[PDB]
């Protein structure tokens, strides 16, 4: 459904928020087949596994050469750097306490920094993530006894203090 917003339902994933964007993070072993969807990763690209996901924003693709072959290729507009698909315009962008993403406000594809919570781009530091600044959580955490929480530099819906994830139903329940 186009761009990821606070209303997006991450299929088999969950919303995380940084200083400049929101994205879906996948569960357990799953990988992003699109910006909203997570599915099982395939280990070997073959004639049988074509079109299937083999990594975040990476799919097994048929190469129509002589002979035909198969490879795990990043989606259009991305390139494999450090065994992860990143936008072509972020290839040589070092953001520091953050990650490089495509600036949605610039009609020409451009790389900008989205920062860990507590940081924002710093014009004095080549627009890196080294300026202390507040980012108010925009997530609508409406599930049972859940609230927005900063965890490892990202905002995420998690159990309120005093509650834990029930091991049967995967809902937040009182510790006991």
């Amino acid at each position, epitope marked *: 459904t186009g761009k990821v917003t606070v209303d997006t339902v991450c299929k088999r994933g969950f919303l995380i928020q940084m200083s400049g964007h929101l994205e879906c993070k996948c569960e357990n072993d799953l990988v992003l087949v699109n910006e909203e969807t997570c599915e099982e990763k395939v280990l070997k690209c073959d004639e049988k596994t074509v079109n299937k996901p083999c990594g975040d924003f990476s799919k097994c693709i048929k190469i*129509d*050469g*002589n002979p035909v072959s198969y490879a795990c290729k990043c989606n259009l507009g991305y390139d494999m750097v450090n065994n992860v698909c990143i936008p072509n315009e972020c290839k040589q962008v070092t953001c520091g306490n953050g990650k490089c993403i495509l600036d949605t406000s610039n009609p020409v594809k451009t790389g900008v920094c989205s920062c860990n919570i507590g940081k924002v781009p710093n014009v004095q530091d080549q627009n890196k993530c080294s300026k202390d600044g507040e980012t108010k959580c925009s997530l609508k955490c409406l599930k049972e006894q859940e609230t927005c929480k900063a965890v490892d530099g990202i905002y995420k819906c998690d159990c309120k203090d005093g509650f834990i994830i029930d091991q049967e139903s995967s809902i937040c329940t009182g510790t006991k």
Partner: single-chain antibody, 254 residues
Framework: QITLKESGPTLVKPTQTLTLTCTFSGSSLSTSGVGVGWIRQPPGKALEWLALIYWNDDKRYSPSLKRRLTITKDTSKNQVVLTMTNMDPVDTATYYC????????????????????????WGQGTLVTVSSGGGSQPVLTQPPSASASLGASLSLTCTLSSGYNNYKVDWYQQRPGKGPRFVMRVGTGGIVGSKGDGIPDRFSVLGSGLNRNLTIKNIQEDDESDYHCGADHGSGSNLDYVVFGGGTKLTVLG
């Protein structure tokens, strides 16, 4: 667009070494590209692939000219350099710097997410004059010449040799006085991927068995040109070698 500018000496004396340089702009390290190479053409004759260097510093050379060829790259200066030893008058040719990139992703007949690698951008080339002083490979057969009237329709043919009925070929259009440009790739069915930039909708391709046809419809004056078909032999980015046909010269009557 990716611009390729050839530079180097244009007059060489026999037995000397030729050193051509190519300066590329619009690509850095696999930003919609996998390599940069060289293709030459003796005046009025068939294209001949020479060498290729990948961005992983891998190299490929023409099997028959390997002992004479060296290719290097200096990414800091956006340059690749070809070196050809023991030059001979028959080596008189226009030398084209070429970029090998990947076709925009497409869905084929069976709905299979697909792409391919091809020589998608060509430099204008430089004419090097040398003063006086291959088994079990595909063979591409093209008729030497063709002719058509203005507004007519025509099918140029490119036939594969036996045992190569699954191979896809690329068509290249070389308007006179200008260098080749990619037109379309065609295999056993219809168009493979999409047509090159600047290629008008009046062009289409259809293949069956060993035949690979390029059809030009509503033939205008600017279709008068040499039409070359080539075939890449290699699995993936890989490129063992490249075959070319003799080329067809299309004359537009009227």
């Amino acid at each position: 667009q990716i611009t390729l500018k050839e530079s180097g000496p244009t007059l060489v004396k026999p037995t000397q070494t030729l050193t051509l340089t190519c300066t590329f702009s619009g690509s850095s390290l696999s930003t919609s590209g996998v390599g940069v190479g060289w293709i030459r053409q003796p005046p009025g004759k068939a294209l001949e692939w020479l060498a290729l260097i990948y961005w992983n510093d891998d190299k490929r050379y023409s099997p028959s000219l390997k002992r004479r060829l060296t290719i290097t790259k200096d990414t800091s200066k956006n340059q690749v350099v070809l070196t050809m030893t023991n030059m001979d008058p028959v080596d008189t040719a226009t030398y084209y710097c070429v970029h090998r990139g990947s076709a925009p992703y497409y869905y084929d007949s069976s709905g299979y997410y697909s792409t391919f690698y091809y020589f998608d951008y060509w430099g204008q080339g430089t004419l090097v004059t040398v003063s006086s002083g291959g088994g079990s490979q595909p063979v591409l057969t093209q008729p030497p010449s063709a002719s058509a009237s203005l507004g007519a329709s025509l099918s140029l043919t490119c036939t594969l040799s036996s045992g190569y009925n699954n191979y896809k070929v690329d068509w290249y259009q070389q308007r006179p006085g200008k260098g080749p440009r990619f037109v379309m790739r065609v295999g056993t069915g219809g168009i493979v991927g999409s047509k090159g930039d600047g290629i008008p909708d009046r062009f289409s391709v259809l293949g069956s068995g060993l035949n690979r046809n390029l059809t030009i419809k509503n033939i205008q004056e600017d279709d008068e040109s040499d039409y070359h078909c080539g075939a890449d032999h290699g699995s993936g980015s890989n490129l063992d070698y490249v075959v070319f046909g003799g080329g067809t010269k299309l004359t537009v009557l009227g």
